[PDB]
Amino acid sequence: PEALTTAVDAAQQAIALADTLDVLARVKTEHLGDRSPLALARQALAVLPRAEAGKRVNAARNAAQRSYDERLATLRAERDAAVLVAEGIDVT
């Protein structure tokens, strides 16, 4: 269909709103999981008589994947950096 404003934009604001790996885990399965609306386009992408719509449908997931990947690595960096400071000891 045309879900460039209701599926990609609805996910890029819910991904950036998550500040926890647990919150981001729920947004994953709701906006990029197997039961996601963006997944429904590929599940029915072969019952279509591809060239003019495939690159436009794949670009909907290529943009939604970047938001999850750039947020996962960011929250992973914040989590890893915080464990190191919390594990500091007096070496003397």
Binding site: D80, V83, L84, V85, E87, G88, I89, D90, V91, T92
Partner: protein, 167 residues
């Protein structure tokens, strides 16, 4: 085994954990590092969790041939404990050195046996309690003589690391 004194100072040096890594000095000369390895290094390398390591340059450790002549006083010792509150990132060794510098020659042994944090102490603080053993070389030390030496140690730690006597 090398008959040298050694100080450990905080350092950040891969592949060690930046918060659990000491750089080893003999005098003012670095001679190596020790502590726990970095968690990212451990995972990428397939190492056991919590692996620790030490590496020293033996050729940087100077050779020592000491000829000790220890002072062995037979007179009784006075035992006192001091509880000092400092900021949480003040190394315990710096507090002990300040206590030792103020106590003078009467101080025979100092040993840290308690590091405490909590609401009784305050945020960003910690409490260190040292066991002090005083002894005179020519007389039985009195409680007042030892307390005067203890008070001078407390004053030294106050000026050097900002220690506050625990109340």
């Amino acid at each position: 085994a090398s008959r040298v004194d050694v100080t450990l100072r905080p350092a950040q040096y891969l592949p060690w954990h930046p918060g659990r890594c000491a750089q080893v000095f003999v005098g003012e000369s670095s001679v190596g590092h020790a502590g726990q390895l970095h968690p990212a290094v451990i995972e990428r390398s397939g190492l056991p969790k919590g692996t620790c390591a030490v590496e020293l340059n033996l050729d940087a450790i100077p050779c020592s041939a000491p000829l000790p002549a220890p002072r062995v006083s037979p007179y009784p010792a006075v035992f006192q404990d001091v509880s000092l509150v400092v900021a949480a990132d003040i190394p315990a060794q710096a507090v002990a050195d300040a206590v030792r510098a103020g106590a003078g020659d009467l101080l025979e042994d100092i040993a840290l046996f308690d590091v405490f944090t909590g609401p009784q102490i305050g945020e960003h603080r910690k409490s260190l309690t040292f066991a002090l053993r005083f002894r005179a070389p020519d007389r039985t030390l009195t409680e007042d003589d030892a307390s005067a030496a203890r008070d001078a140690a407390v004053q030294s730690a106050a000026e050097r690391v900002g220690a506050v006597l625990r109340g």
